[PDB]
């Protein structure tokens, strides 16, 4: 049996999002890619550095927004610009988000020497694709 990235069946009480529901073989078929850069295209360089930066950027956002992330973040690289698009629950006060956005942008722009912007779409609660 294959176990990779597969949320298993229980008794029909486990909420799963659209991203979680689909196993790896649905990548490029039903669900797209969370990161979009040019480093895995044919004849392109610096794939290892884009991949390492993404791993860190995901751990950073999880810790900086603990319990406030509704789904996995989406990373979009254009030129030297980095764009982080995160679905965030409406738990924290509004002014706290403005603090964490200013902090997380400045800190990650001085760490990777690129302009980094954070895009936050607030949801009332996690969106459930199906109950499995």
């Amino acid at each position: 049996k294959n176990r990779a990235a597969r949320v298993r069946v229980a008794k029909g009480n486990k909420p799963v999002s659209y991203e979680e529901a689909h196993a790896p073989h649905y990548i490029a078929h039903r669900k797209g890619w969370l990161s979009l850069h040019t480093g895995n295209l044919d004849g392109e360089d610096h794939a290892a550095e884009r991949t390492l930066e993404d791993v860190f950027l995901r751990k950073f956002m999880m810790g900086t927004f603990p319990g406030c992330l509704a789904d996995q973040i989406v990373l979009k690289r254009r030129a030297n610009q980095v764009d982080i698009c995160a679905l965030v629950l409406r738990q924290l006060p509004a002014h706290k988000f403005y603090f964490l956005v200013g902090y997380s942008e400045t800190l990650l722009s001085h760490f990777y020497k690129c302009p980094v912007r954070l895009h936050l779409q607030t949801v009332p609660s996690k969106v459930v694709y199906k109950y499995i």
Partner: peptide
């Protein structure tokens, strides 16, 4: 050598949609 990751670590990022353009 292109990503500098082991086969086990690469599969975890690829199977979760986290590598840009990698599919099965």
């Amino acid at each position: 050598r292109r990503w500098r990751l082991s086969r086990i670590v690469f599969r975890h990022l690829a199977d979760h949609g986290l590598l840009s353009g990698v599919q099965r």
